[PDB]
Amino acid sequence: PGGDFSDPVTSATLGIVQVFWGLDKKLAQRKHFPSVNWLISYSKYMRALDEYYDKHFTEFVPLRTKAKEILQEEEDLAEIVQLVGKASLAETDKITLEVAKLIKDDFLQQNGYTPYDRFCPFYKTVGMLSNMISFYDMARRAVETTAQSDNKITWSIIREHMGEILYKLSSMKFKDPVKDGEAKIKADYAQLLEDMQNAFRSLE
Amino acid sequence: RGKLIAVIGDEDTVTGFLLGGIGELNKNRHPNFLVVEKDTTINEIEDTFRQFLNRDDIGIILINQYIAEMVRHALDAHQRSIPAVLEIPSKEHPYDAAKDSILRRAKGMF
Amino acid sequence: KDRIEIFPSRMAQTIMKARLKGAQTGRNLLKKKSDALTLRFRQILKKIIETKMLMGEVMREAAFSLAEAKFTAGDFSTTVIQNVNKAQVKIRAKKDNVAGVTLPVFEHYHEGTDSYELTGLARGGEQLAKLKRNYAKAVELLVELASLQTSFVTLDEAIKITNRRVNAIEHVIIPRIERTLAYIITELDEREREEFYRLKKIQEKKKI
Numbered sequence: 001p002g003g004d005f006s007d008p009v010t011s012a013t014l015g016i017v018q019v020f021w022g023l024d025k026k027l028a029q030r031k032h033f034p035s036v037n038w039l040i041s042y043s044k045y046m047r048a049l050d051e052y053y054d055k056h057f058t059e060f061v062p063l064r065t066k067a068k069e070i071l072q073e074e075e076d077l078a079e080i081v082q083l084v085g086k087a088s089l090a091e092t093d094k095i096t097l098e099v100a101k102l103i104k105d106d107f108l109q110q111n112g113y114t115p116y117d118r119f120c121p122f123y124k125t126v127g128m129l130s131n132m133i134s135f136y137d138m139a140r141r142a143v144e145t146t147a148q149s150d151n152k153i154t155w156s157i158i159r160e161h162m163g164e165i166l167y168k169l170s171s172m173k174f175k176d177p178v179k180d181g182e183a184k185i186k187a188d189y190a191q192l193l194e195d196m197q198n199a200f201r202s203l204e
Numbered sequence: 205r206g207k208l209i210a211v212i213g214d215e216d217t218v219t220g221f222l223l224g225g226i227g228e229l230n231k232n233r234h235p236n237f238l239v240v241e242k243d244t245t246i247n248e249i250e251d252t253f254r255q256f257l258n259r260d261d262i263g264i265i266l267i268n269q270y271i272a273e274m275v276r277h278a279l280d281a282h283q284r285s286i287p288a289v290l291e292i293p294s295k296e297h298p299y300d301a302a303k304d305s306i307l308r309r310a311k312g313m314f
Numbered sequence: 315k316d317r318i319e320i321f322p323s324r325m326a327q328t329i330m331k332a333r334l335k336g337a338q339t340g341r342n343l344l345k346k347k348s349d350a351l352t353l354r355f356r357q358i359l360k361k362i363i364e365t366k367m368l369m370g371e372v373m374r375e376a377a378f379s380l381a382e383a384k385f386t387a388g389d390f391s392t393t394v395i396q397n398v399n400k401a402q403v404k405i406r407a408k409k410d411n412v413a414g415v416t417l418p419v420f421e422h423y424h425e426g427t428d429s430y431e432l433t434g435l436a437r438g439g440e441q442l443a444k445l446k447r448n449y450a451k452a453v454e455l456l457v458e459l460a461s462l463q464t465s466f467v468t469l470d471e472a473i474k475i476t477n478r479r480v481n482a483i484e485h486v487i488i489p490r491i492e493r494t495l496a497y498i499i500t501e502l503d504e505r506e507r508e509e510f511y512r513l514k515k516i517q518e519k520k521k522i
Contacts, residue, residue, distance in 0.1 A: 003325075079336065206404065208401050209403075209453075215391060216377070220380055225403040225453065226403055301363060306467055310359060
């Protein structure tokens with residue numbers, strides 16, 4: 001009743017159930033389906049599934065960890081950055097805010113009514129997260145290197161160099177599995193990652 | 205290249221400051237400076253001061269204690285940062301620390 | 315006015331607890347910002363008086379050299395005032411991120427215009443060059459003082475804004491939510507008590 005946790009059924013079921021996928025009313029008023037809270041939900045199954053992951057892929061765990069760190073860091077930042085007019089952001093904070101907002105927009109929101117969202121297979125999500133995290137990582141490293149040496153790199157120069165590749169990454173959402181084959185999507189994402197690396201080398 | 209310092213002072217101060225290099229003719233070709241003397245009415249000084257402040261390509265203003273004292277209300281009627289106004293000593297009017305607009309904004313700290 | 319408007323319920327207790335905690339965190343954050351601003355204020359208002367007394371000393375030297383220039387060559391002031399076409403030092407507008415807010419500053423810029431040659435009036439080149447150098451120093455030093463006082467005049471508005479915000483967060487928002495928390499806890503206790511009495515009386519009737 002009312003979405004809260006005081007009801008005895010909620011308290012009793014929460015102490016038995018291994019996984020919890022709580023809903024948030026405000027996010028459902030945003031029509032940001034699926035309307036998950038993303039901060040109270042948990043799952044006591046990551047460790048058990050690490051063994052399964054390390055038999056086929058061996059690369060999902062670091063991506064999941066880094067994405068969760070980005071999301072939680074932005075969740076912490078939001079109100080704090082609101083308090084100061086969102087003006088005095090360090091470079092890391094700005095990349096965190098923008099990347100987290102884009103991640104919430106694209107990689108954590110869908111509706112099956114399109115052919116490319118009815119079912120996102122495991123490999124599709126793996127590739128999406130992989131390329132998005134590679135983008136974030138390389139942006140952060142570009143910032144850090146020239147911050148240590150000289151001429152602190154802003155997001156502006158990276159955009160001015162490779163906005164084309166950035167929006168190639170933004171458009172990985174719509175690589176439709178119904179039409180594109182599995183190999184098509186995988187090779188597409190791999191090519192976009194190689195072009196990410198080469199464009200960043202060109203900027204260097 | 206943007207803004208140019210201004211000078212409202214007697215003959216000694218203005219000659220000294222113009223020898224410092226500053227001073228340009230604008231679109232109307234008016235001078236960057238003004239000559240103040242004993243034979244210089246208040247209205248001319250006040251109108252020229254407002255004239256300079258309205259020419260936003262000046263930025264900095266240099267006025268001694270006495271000229272500013274003559275139009276004191278028109279001096280302390282200004283509270284802005286970019287069009288800075290400076291209060292400098294003078295051989296004929298050495299500085300009094302009790303008289304400054306910026307230290308009036310800072311009054312109470314001691 | 316006195317108390318937040320929300321129906322007494324346990325979710326409302328958690329919600330007002332979250333609101334109070336957010337208020338407290340914002341309180342602490344803006345206090346830290348205010349501390350930083352006050353430190354900046356103190357260290358920019360340290361010895362501006364001494365800089366200005368140094369300016370007085372410099373222009374004492376300048377006035378003495380001007381008297382020397384009057385002495386050696388006689389009369390060139392009217393020629394200096396008469397010929398004024400373009401300047402020799404301008405200002406490159408700039409801003410200074412001393413803190414989360416930004417404060418205007420300025421930079422001396424040597425435009426490089428050639429100085430008027432004084433060789434006709436008793437060949438007064440050396441003394442006029444000395445006066446030119448003295449005022450060349452004075453210009454730069456007063457540009458530095460100008461930047462300092464510009465930033466100082468700018469800082470006070472932000473200081474006042476921060477202080478009023480912290481005071482409001484300490485005087486208005488917190489007591490209201492605290493009184494609401496007291497009201498909601500006592501009302502929920504009342505309602506549990508009413509249910510308890512209902513249960514007591516039904517078991518009393520069940521005694522029959």
